Structures are given as structure tokens and as C-alpha cells.
Design a protein around this ligand. Structure first.
Ligand SMILES: CCN(CC)C(=O)[C@@H]1C=C2c3cccc4[nH]cc(c34)C[C@H]2N(C)C1
Ligand SMILES: *[C@@H]1O[C@H](CO)[C@@H](O)[C@H](O)[C@H]1NC(C)=O
Length: 254
């Protein structure tokens, strides 16, 4: 069925990230500090594909029924917010980097940047576990693990504003600023991949701010769009790494 095709699309997500990290770790001619930041995208996307996606596939297979203990329901959601957000902000840093380069003419700076990005992601993700889910029964086989509008109403709005629209505005500004000052074929196409997450957040804000909209109608659209988001997140690092020819030569070696 569709599950086989979905699994055949998940396998590349694990494959590409491990290929990228193997390319970085194996060779020494690609050891410049800017690749250390790409390592963060590689590991984040690898973790997403390894953990989040299979749970979603089983949630599709077993109809809205949790196949795991109750305690795991919040934690999974926490991870679903921790890694995905961590991806998006990373892209923003790349834009900033290019800006600095355009106005330019060490390892510590890269480590500081990575740490700051990850702390921002943790801060955004940490509201979820502390305020847990609410259910009428204690049996995991009778419940559905979905964030509700009533329990999380302000969190969804502010998390969508912080995680998506702020970095989006930052890059929209920095692109024009760079143009008012290799850089074109890459940035234009590598930032349009972000667009593939916009429909999820637009629909989420619509659900937050509409009191006369059919919730059931919007829920199916959200479920459809979330998978497109995962596809974009998984495909971005391979698309980036294939641009260089040294990476293409290295990949075939092992
Ligand atoms: C289809 C249902 N699911 C999965 C259970 C979601 O809607 C997830 C909810 C997310 C979410 C909500 C609210 C704020 C947010 N910031 C960052 C994310 C986020 C990530 C985002 N993940 C990717 C999908
Ligand atoms: C609730 O879980 C029990 C498990 O014993 C199952 O038999 C029952 O059909 C479930 N109720 C539903 C799915 O409405």
C-alpha cells in the first residue's frame, strides 16, 4: 500500500545524512569549519528520520491509537518540536554567514553558534513536557496523541510565530540586503525549500484564530502537510551536499 512507498521514502532520509557525516569524518580535505555547521543539519535530519517518522507511520497504520505506554506520548511530541525547529534556525545562520562573507573583505565561533541554536531550540520545545496531555481514560489503546486547541492555545500561536516567521523575516531581509551589496543558484533555491513548511504553520494559525472553522476538515490538511514538511527537511541536506563536485567524488569512493 502507501506504507511501502512511505518507507521507501524514509530510507533515503537515514541514508543521506549518514553518507554526509561519513564524508565529513572520513576525509581531511573537507575539514574547514563551515562543514562543521552542516554536520548539525546532518545529525538533526538523521535523528528526525530515525525516530519521528516511523512513529507517524504506525500512527497512520493504527487509526489514531497509541501503540506505546502513556508516558512516552509527551516525550515524543517534545522531540517532534525539538529537532524540527532546530533544523529551521540552522538555515537562518547560513544566510547570516553569507551576509558576513559579503561584508567580510575559527572553531570556537562555530561551536558557539551551534550551541546557541540548540539552546534556542530547547527553550522553544520545553513548554510541552511540563504541561502534559489530558485524557478521560488511562488506556493507551483508547487515546490519540494530538495537541489540542483548548489545552495548548497560546503555545501553538507563539511557537508558530517564533519557530517559523521570525527566521523567515530575518532571511527575507538579509537576502535583499545582500543583493544591495556561488551565492545566487544556491541561496534562491535552498531557501525556497523552506516554503514547503509554510502551509503547515498557516493552517495551524488558522485553527488557532478561527472559531467558525470545521476542525475535522483542517485536521486532515494538517496531517497531509506534516509529511511534506518531513520530506523537505530530509531532502534539504542531500540537495545542498550534491552541489559540490568534491563531495560527489568522495561519495562514490566508499
Ligand atoms: C500533524 C500533528 N503534528 C505531529 C504530532 C504536528 O502538528 C506537529 C506539531 C508541530 C508544532 C506545533 C506547534 C508549534 C510548533 N513549532 C514547531 C513545531 C510545532 C513542529 C510541528 N511538528 C513538525 C508537527
Ligand atoms: C478501547 O480499547 C479496548 C482494548 O481492550 C478495545 O477493545 C476497544 O475496542 C477500544 N475502544 C474503541 C477503539 O473505541
Amino acid at each position: 500500500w502507501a506504507a511501502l512507498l512511505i518507507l521507501m521514502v524514509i530510507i533515503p532520509t537515514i541514508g543521506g545524512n549518514t553518507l554526509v557525516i561519513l564524508a565529513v569524518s572520513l576525509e581531511k580535505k573537507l575539514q574547514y569549519a563551515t562543514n562543521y555547521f552542516l554536520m548539525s543539519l546532518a545529525v538533526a535530519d538523521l535523528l528526525v528520520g530515525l525516530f519521528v517518522m516511523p512513529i507517524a507511520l504506525l500512527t497512520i497504520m493504527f487509526e489514531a491509537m497509541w501503540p506505546l505506554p502513556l508516558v512516552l506520548c509527551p516525550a515524543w511530541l517534545f522531540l517532534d518540536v525539538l529537532f524540527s525547529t532546530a533544523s529551521i534556525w540552522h538555515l537562518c545562520a547560513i544566510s547570516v554567514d553569507r551576509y558576513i562573507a559579503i561584508k567580510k573583505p575559527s572553531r570556537a565561533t562555530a561551536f558557539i553558534k551551534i550551541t546557541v541554536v540548540w539552546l534556542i531550540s530547547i527553550g522553544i520545545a520545553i513548554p510541552v513536557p511540563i504541561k502534559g496531555i489530558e485524557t478521560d481514560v488511562d488506556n493507551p489503546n483508547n487515546i490519540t496523541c494530538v495537541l489540542t486547541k483548548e489545552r495548548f492555545g497560546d503555545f501553538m500561536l507563539f511557537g508558530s510565530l517564533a519557530a517559523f516567521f521570525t527566521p523567515l523575516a530575518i532571511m527575507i531581509v538579509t537576502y535583499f540586503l545582500t543583493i544591495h551589496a556561488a551565492s545566487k543558484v544556491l541561496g534562491i533555491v535552498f531557501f525556497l525549500f523552506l516554503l514547503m513548511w509554510c502551509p503547515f504553520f498557516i493552517t495551524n494559525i488558522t485553527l488557532v484564530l478561527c472559531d467558525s472553522c470545521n476542525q475535522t476538515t483542517l485536521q486532515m490538511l494538517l496531517e497531509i502537510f506534516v509529511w511534506i514538511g518531513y520530506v523537505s527537511s530530509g531532502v534539504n541536506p542531500l540537495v545542498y551536499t550534491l552541489f559540490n563536485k568534491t563531495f560527489r567524488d568522495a561519495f562514490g569512493r566508499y
